[PDB]
Amino acid sequence: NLLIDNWIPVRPRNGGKVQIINLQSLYCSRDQWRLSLPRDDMELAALALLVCIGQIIAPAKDDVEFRHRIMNPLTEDEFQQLIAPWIDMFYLNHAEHPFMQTKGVKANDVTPMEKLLAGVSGATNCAFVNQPGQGEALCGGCTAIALFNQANQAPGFGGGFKSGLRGGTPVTTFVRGIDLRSTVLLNVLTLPRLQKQFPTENQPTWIKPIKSNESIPASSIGFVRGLFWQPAHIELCDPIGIGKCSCCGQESNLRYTGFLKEKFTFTVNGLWPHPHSPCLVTVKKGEVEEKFLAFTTSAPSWTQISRVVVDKIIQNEGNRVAAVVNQFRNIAPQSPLELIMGGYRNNQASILERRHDVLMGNVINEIVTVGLGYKTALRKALYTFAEGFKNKDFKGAGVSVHETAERHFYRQSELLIPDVLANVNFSQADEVIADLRDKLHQLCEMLFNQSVAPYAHHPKLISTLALARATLYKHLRELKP
């Protein structure tokens, strides 16, 4: 039981050895913890799970109690009081309602644990490039975490398997605290905002199951049914004895070795108001449409400061912040706000990329702003080239050049970043940023010329090419102050 037993993988904020604690030890002590796992994305899945749990067991009645609970840990009594019915809802190995599972799965073979590990399998190159046997024996915690991550962040297993309410691969955006406890409490909506957010069947999908081929209005899903939503038919196998978890390397009494899955489709009409992801607001006809943010053709990320990149992309480019973030803004508007964020880039069922910033000033923001400026310059230029290329009845990868160029841009610029970070201070900021501008100008010229290179000696495309380059320089010209 997640709410009782030890499963949370932690190590002291600035300390050493990994230990495994329980929810009470987390909620009822001034100990500074941080999650500790071999994988950033699993750390994000863990934090997401804890945030959801806290969201259903202890919403503050007002902002005052919110701040109060953040600055002051509960007593153990209050905790138990808060967790009882939810105690009954959280069992990994149970009779009728296993955690995020479905009893009575009809399958011929047992699915290996690797299918829950988000990138270990999914593609052919996976078999060739990854270390084998990463999922031969997973402890309880890693199993719960993996299940949740598969229910939210990862794409479905394959044909006949559905993805989360936020779509296949969404970006998750959390408010970053000083330690773990603070982070969890920080990303929990207060009761009033919770009501304003969810204006239903408020029972889990592993207690009140989904009906095959049924249509479900998104408005008809309770918030605990959605926060703990489960779209594929999964059922763990019986665990094994004491040994090392093949995923986290820790010792554990119970280790799971496989599970049973089966195809299961339905339909959720409309968009469930999930509080953990930013979204894009489009106006179509006269109606307002929203789509959750996802790493589509590129996953914007610089080393050390990816969270800033994402934050600025959400702030500046009609993107709307996540609900927990909006709440935090409204509670502490004058307070600085850094994100804990994560997401995958995927071909269908195969992951292509992972970007995850999970850690626990104005110059950096300026830097990111500049970078994105040059990125946009290049993208507009090469989209001009792309459209011109299409309209000229040409075929091939001439259309999708802007996407590849964007990805490449992020890479090379990431080669540029560490020195920039190293030389930044009060007096040197303007100069290092100027040098950065020069470098990025050069890099944009290079990536434009490179992405356009395979279409030399194509006499027609000259018109297109010309326009394209002009566009680039226009924007580049607009980027020098």
Partner 1 sequence: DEIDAMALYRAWQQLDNGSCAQIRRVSEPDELRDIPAFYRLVQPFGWENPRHQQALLRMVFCLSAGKNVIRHQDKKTGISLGRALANSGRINERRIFQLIRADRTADMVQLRRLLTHAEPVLDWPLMARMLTWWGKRERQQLLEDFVLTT
Partner 2 sequence: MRSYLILRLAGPMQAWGQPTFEGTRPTGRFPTRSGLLGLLGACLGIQRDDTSSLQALSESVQFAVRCDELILDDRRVSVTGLRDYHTVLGAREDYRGLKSHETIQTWREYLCDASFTVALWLTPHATMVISELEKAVLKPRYTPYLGRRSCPLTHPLFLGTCQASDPQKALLNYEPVGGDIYSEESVTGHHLKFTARDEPMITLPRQFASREWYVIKGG
Partner 3 sequence: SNFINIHVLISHSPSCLNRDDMNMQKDAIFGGKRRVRISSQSLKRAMRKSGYYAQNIGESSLRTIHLAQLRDVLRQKLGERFDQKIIDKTLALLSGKSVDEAEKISADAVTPWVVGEIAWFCEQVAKAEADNLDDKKLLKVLKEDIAAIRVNLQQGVDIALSGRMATSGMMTELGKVDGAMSIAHAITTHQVDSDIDWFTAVDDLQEQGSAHLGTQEFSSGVFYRYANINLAQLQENLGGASREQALEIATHVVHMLATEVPGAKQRTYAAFNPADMVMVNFSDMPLSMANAFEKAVKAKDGFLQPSIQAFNQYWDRVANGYGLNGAAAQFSLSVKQMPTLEQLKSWVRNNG
**Residue selected from 203, 372, 435, 473 as contacting DNA according to rule CB under 7 A:** 473
Q: Is 411 in the site for partner 2 (CB under 8 A)?
A: yes
Q: Is 442 in the site for partner 1 (CB under 8 A)?
A: no
What residues have CB less than 8 Å from 363, skipping those under 6 apart? 424, 429, 433
The listed partner (DNA, Zn ion, partner 3, none) that binds 128, CB under 5 to 8 Å by sort, is partner 3
- Matching residue, tokens 């800033």: 308
The listed partner (partner 2, Zn ion, partner 1, none) that binds 178, CB under 5 to 8 Å by sort, is none
For the four alpha carbons of 241, 34, 279 and 290, in that order, the dihedral sign comes to positive
DSSP states of 377-443: HHHHHHHHHHHHHHHTT--STTSTHHHHHHHHHHHHHHHHHHHHHHH-STTTHHHHHHHHHHHHHHH
> Which one of 61-69, 132-140, 185-193, 352-360 is the stretch in contact with Zn ion (CB under 5 A)?
132-140
For the four alpha carbons of 90, 96, 98 and 101, in that order, the dihedral sign comes to negative
Q: Is 419 in the site for partner 2 (CB under 8 A)?
A: yes
- Matching residue, tokens 């610029």: 413
Query: How is residue 185 written in tokens?
Result: 């409490």
Shortest separation between residue 318's beta carbon and DNA, angstroms: 11
Mark 33-72 with x for binding to partner 2 (rule: CB under 8 A) and - for no binding.
---x-xxx--------------------------------
Give the C-alpha separation, 258 to 254, whole Å. Answer: 13
Shortest separation between residue 408's beta carbon and partner 1, angstroms: 21
Give the C-alpha separation, 42 to 53, whole Å. Answer: 16
Q: Is 418 in the site for partner 2 (CB under 8 A)?
A: yes
Residues 292-351 that bind DNA (CB under 7 A): 294, 296-297, 348-349
Q: Is 316 in the site for partner 2 (CB under 8 A)?
A: no
Give the C-alpha separation, 427 to 53, whole Å. Answer: 46
Is the CB of 258 or the CB of 275 nearer to partner 2?
A: 258
> Which one of 10-18, 244-252, 399-407, 456-464 is the stretch in contact with partner 1 (CB under 8 A)?
456-464
Give the C-alpha separation, 331 to 309, whole Å. Answer: 23
Give the C-alpha separation, 134 to 146, whole Å. Answer: 13
Q: Is 131 in the site for partner 2 (CB under 8 A)?
A: yes
Longest dimension (CA), the chain: 78
Reference 219, options 201, 232, 203; nearest CA is 201
> Which one of 58-66, 144-152, 382-390, 417-425 is the stretch in contact with partner 2 (CB under 8 A)?
417-425
Shortest separation between residue 173's beta carbon and partner 2, angstroms: 20
Query: How is residue 213 written in tokens?
Result: 């081929």
CB 358 within 8 A of CB 40: yes
The listed partner (partner 3, partner 2, partner 1, none) that binds 453, CB under 5 to 8 Å by sort, is partner 3
Reference 316, options 257, 245, 369; nearest CA is 369
**How many residues are present in the chain?**
481
Q: Is 93 in the site for partner 2 (CB under 8 A)?
A: no
The listed partner (DNA, partner 1, partner 3, none) that binds 161, CB under 5 to 8 Å by sort, is DNA
CB 264 within 8 A of CB 162: yes
Reference 95, options 85, 103, 87; nearest CA is 103
Query: How is residue 326 written in tokens?
Result: 């909006």
The listed partner (partner 3, partner 2, partner 1, none) that binds 467, CB under 5 to 8 Å by sort, is partner 1
Mark 343-382 with x for binding to partner 2 (rule: CB under 8 A) and - for no binding.
--------xxxx----x-----------------------
The listed partner (DNA, partner 1, Zn ion, none) that binds 248, CB under 5 to 8 Å by sort, is Zn ion
Q: Is 284 in the site for partner 3 (CB under 8 A)?
A: no
Q: Is 400 in the site for DNA (CB under 7 A)?
A: yes
CB 371 within 8 A of CB 305: no
* Interface residue list for DNA (CB under 7 A): 155-156, 158-163, 167-169, 265, 291, 294, 296-297, 348-349, 379-380, 383-384, 387-388, 400, 402-403, 467, 470-471, 473-475, 477
